[PDB]
Design a binder for these strands. Structure first.
Ligand SMILES: CO[C@@H]1[C@H](O)[C@H](n2cnc3c(=O)nc(N)[nH]c32)O[C@H]1COP(=O)(O)OP(=O)(O)OP(=O)(O)O
Ligand SMILES: [Zn+2]
Ligand SMILES: [Zn+2]
Ligand SMILES: [Zn+2]
Lengths: 49, 67, 257, 48, 44
RNA sequence: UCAACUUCAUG
């Protein structure tokens, strides 16, 4: 049954208990942004990482 | 690590049923019959007890940092 | 041009369950009543935890999580209690919250099962649905858990800890006569418990003029609120949301004029 | 712009310190660039 | 501060610039011990 | 708040 409207979904949906794993890759570890931050000595270009 | 309070899918309290489940398993009851005796009806709640691994007992073997 | 008059028939009433049928109502109204059951019925649950000492294996925020999920009796005073935002006093006070305390130490050799029974409330009306018990943590000898908690009014839209219900079963058209679900092979499909069809007939004949009515509900209580009062509070809360909407609408219409 | 004799190295250009920065650790020590070490070797051999 | 011993679990008070050795057991691993200030946890 | 190197992962 559709959660928002309550109407039965016309196509019957495949449901069951499946085992799922949470991989170590998480968005908080990957989000990054740069704006005139630290700069390397030799190249005098923005740093890496 | 320890039996979750409340089934994830619906929210029925399953935290109070682990010790009773283990006792019923010791009695003779099959896993399904014990789950029925505890009142777990939907397969979402039965997954909570059936698939639970109680690691808190293994962690309690290590001695506490402060005694 | 006006609202239909709904009718209710309660089939089952037990301390944990209410099975009822609402007839002559719209699908939207019925679904939103179910939605309010799940998300917009106020309840009392722990939302502030301060752990003085936690030497248990579980970390502090794990303990706080488990304490928040513990149901608390909220039958009468949840309507009296105010939200923390509404209360004039800074932080929390008897009117906006309830205080619990836990002081457990495993002095004995045998493992001590800290349960919801060990939580002690300052007001007798809120108790952790103890009258087994929910296991907060297991303590080895020499391990101690001491904490103070404050429980506040809230509803399930904020957090699932405030859900007053376990599973709301909602069904309409038990025998498919509006063809809202089109079975590829109707015979393979199990009959509903509310189905009135004979065993030979898999589906009722298509009703071209039909509209979803006679909705069947089974509301299971989590123990915090009685299953009857979950439904009554949901109806009242939906009515209050509509009335607030109407007040704001009238004010803005007056402003436009 | 280029005479064949100028190809043979009689004067070795020593790059500025910007080209070969001094690599500082904790103020306790200053490692030197590979170019600085190679130039030190060249100076030693030239003096010998 | 006061450091709890790793092995014998007895609090010992070690001044700054002092070797990290528990009295009466000699273990060289100490732990800083929980803070007096209290942190609020939302049960969520 | 350095730099080289390696390895391991992500597309
Ligand atoms: C579809 O093409 C992409 C891109 O070409 C880019 N890519 C990825 N790895 C590399 C690499 O090593 N070097 C370069 N240059 N590009 C690379 O990744 C390719 C696919 O790889 P995949 O086949 O694993 O994608 P699934 O089919 O596996 O997707 P699921 O169902 O998991 O989501
Ligand atoms: Zn469940
Ligand atoms: Zn207050
Ligand atoms: Zn020691």
């Amino acid at each position: 049954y559709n959660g928002f409207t309550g109407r039965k979904i016309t196509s019957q949906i495949f449901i069951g208990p499946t085992y799922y794993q949470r991989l170590k890759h998480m968005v908080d570890d990957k989000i990054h942004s740069r704006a005139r931050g630290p700069i390397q000595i030799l190249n005098r270009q923005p740093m890496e990482g | 690590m320890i039996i979750p309070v409340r089934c994830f899918t619906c929210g029925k309290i399953v935290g109070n049923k682990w010790e009773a489940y283990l006792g019923l398993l010791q009695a003779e009851y099959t896993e399904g019959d014990a789950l029925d005796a505890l009142g777990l009806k939907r397969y979402c709640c039965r997954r909570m007890l059936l698939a639970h691994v109680d690691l808190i007992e293994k962690l309690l073997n290590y001695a506490p940092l402060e005694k | 041009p006006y609202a239909n008059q709904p009718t209710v028939r309660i089939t089952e009433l037990t301390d944990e369950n209410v099975k009822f049928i609402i007839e002559n109502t719209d699908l939207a109204v019925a679904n939103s009543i179910r939605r309010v059951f799940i998300a917009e019925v106020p309840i009392i649950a722990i939302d502030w935890v301060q752990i003085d000492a936690n030497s248990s294996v579980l970390h502090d925020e794990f303990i706080a999580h488990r304490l928040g999920l513990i149901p608390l009796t909220s039958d009468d005073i949840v309507d009296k209690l105010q939200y923390s935002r509404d209360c004039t006093c800074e932080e929390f006070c008897p009117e906006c919250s309830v205080e619990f305390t836990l002081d457990v130490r495993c002095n004995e050799d045998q493992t001590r099962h800290v349960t919801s029974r060990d939580l002690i409330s300052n007001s007798p009306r809120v108790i952790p649905v103890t009258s087994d018990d929910i296991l907060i943590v297991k303590l080895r000898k020499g391990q101690e858990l001491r904490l103070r908690a404050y429980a506040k009014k809230g509803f399930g839209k904020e957090h699932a800890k405030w859900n007053p219900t376990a599973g709301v079963a909602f069904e309409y058209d038990p025998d498919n006569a509006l063809r809202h679900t089109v079975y590829p092979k109707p015979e393979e499909w199990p009959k509903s418990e509310y189905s009135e069809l004979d065993e030979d007939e898999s589906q009722a004949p298509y009703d071209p003029n039909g509209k979803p009515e006679r909705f069947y509900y089974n509301v299971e209580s989590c123990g915090s609120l009685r299953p009857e009062t979950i439904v009554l509070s949901a109806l009242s809360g939906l009515k209050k949301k509509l009335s607030d909407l109407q007040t704001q609408l009238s004010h803005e219409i007056q402003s436009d004029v | 712009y280029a005479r064949p004799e100028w190809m043979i190295v009689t004067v070795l250009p020593v790059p500025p310190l910007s080209v070969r920065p001094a690599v500082v650790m904790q103020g306790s020590a200053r490692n030197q660039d590979d170019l600085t070490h190679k130039l030190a070797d060249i100076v030693k051999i030239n003096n010998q | 501060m006061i450091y709890i011993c790793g092995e014998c679990h007895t609090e010992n008070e070690i001044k700054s610039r002092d070797p990290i050795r528990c009295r009466e057991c000699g273990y060289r691993i100490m732990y800083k011990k929980r803070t007096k200030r209290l942190v609020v946890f939302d049960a969520r």
